[PDB]
Amino acid sequence: MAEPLTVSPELTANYAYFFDLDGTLAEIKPHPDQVVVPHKILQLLDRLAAHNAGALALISGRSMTELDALAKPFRFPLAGVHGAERRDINGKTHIVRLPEAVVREVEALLRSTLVALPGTELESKGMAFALHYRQAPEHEAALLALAQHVTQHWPQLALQLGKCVVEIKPKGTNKGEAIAAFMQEAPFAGRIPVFVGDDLTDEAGFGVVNHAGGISVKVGVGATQAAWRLESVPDVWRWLEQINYP
Numbered sequence: 422m423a424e425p426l427t428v429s430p431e432l433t434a435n436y437a438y439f440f441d442l443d444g445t446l447a448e449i450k451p452h453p454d455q456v457v458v459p460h461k462i463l464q465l466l467d468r469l470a471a472h473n474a475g476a477l478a479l480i481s482g483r484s485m486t487e488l489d490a491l492a493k494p495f496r497f498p499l500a501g502v503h504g505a506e507r508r509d510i511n512g513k514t515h516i517v518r519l520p521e522a523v524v525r526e527v528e529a530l531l532r533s534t535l536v537a538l539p540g541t542e543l544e545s546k547g548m549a550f551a552l553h554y555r556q557a558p559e560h561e562a563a564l565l566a567l568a569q570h571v572t573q574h575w576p577q578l579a580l581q582l583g584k585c586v587v588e589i590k591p592k593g594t595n596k597g598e599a600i601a602a603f604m605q606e607a608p609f610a611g612r613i614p615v616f617v618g619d620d621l622t623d624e625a626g627f628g629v630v631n632h633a634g635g636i637s638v639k640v641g642v643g644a645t646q647a648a649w650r651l652e653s654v655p656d657v658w659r660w661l662e663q664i665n666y667p
């Protein structure tokens with residue numbers, strides 16, 4: 422149902438841009454630390470933001486600090502950990518905080534199960550936990566049942582499924598509310614939201630962008646709620662280049 426995106430918006434239109442990172446602005450890698458956004462693409466994003474009053478943000482499941490490393494030397498408004506971390510246009514950061522006992526008890530729980538799930542990696546994010554299983558796809562059903570049971574015993578936590586990852590996040594955190602928080606703040610407010618993403622976490626953003634009369638763009642294959650689709654990360658780059666230089 423999603424329509425192939427072919428038109429590039431004009432550089433000085435009234436758009437507010439929201440970009441996912443992994444699988445959208447950067448190609449998918451076997452390991453997250455090999456992921457890179459080419460410096461040419463970062464310059465296009467920075468020029469696009471500059472012509473749109475700074476209304477451009479990165480909306481990612483990665484931690485805020487990892488986004489700053491990937492976007493170096495540029496510093497954009499950010500949503501990290503699916504919205505549990507956020508940095509507005511004023512550089513002000515907002516952090517969702519979990520009870521210290523919850524973080525300690527859950528991490529100890531998840532770590533003890535890894536001996537029976539070899540190849541899985543537990544990434545601790547301060548207020549969230551990510552279970553990476555790209556090196557062992559067989560563990561996916563177990564990690565889902567395990568994380569689902571974590572969210573039942575600790576109702577402060579919610580489930581976030583993703584590409585080769587099962588993520589445990591604070592309840593009420595999602596990229597839709599992250600985009601919402603931005604859309605009521607000075608630079609983004611009064612513009613039309615454009616959100617480009619590729620994973621299940623991005624579907625929540627697609628929903629609020631569609632309801633807002635904005636432009637939602639799915640990257641890659643799979644069922645989507647987005648109205649528009651790009652076929653691959655290099656197609657995002659080419660779309661980005663055509664906005665900057667028609």
Ligand SMILES: CCCCCCCCc1ccc(O[C@H]2O[C@H](COS(=O)(=O)O)[C@@H](O)[C@H](O)[C@H]2O)cc1
Pocket residue numbers: 441442443444449450451453480481482483484544551553555584585586620622
């Ligand atoms: C060798 C053949 C290639 C197959 C590789 C398949 C692996 C896909 C994949 C695996 C793990 C990913 O996790 C990373 O990115 C997440 C999403 O970030 S996001 O897309 O900007 O929302 C973050 O949440 C995580 O912290 C970060 O470690 C992201 C993508």
Ligand SMILES: [Mg+2]
Pocket residue numbers: 441442443444482618619620622623
């Ligand atoms: Mg994503």
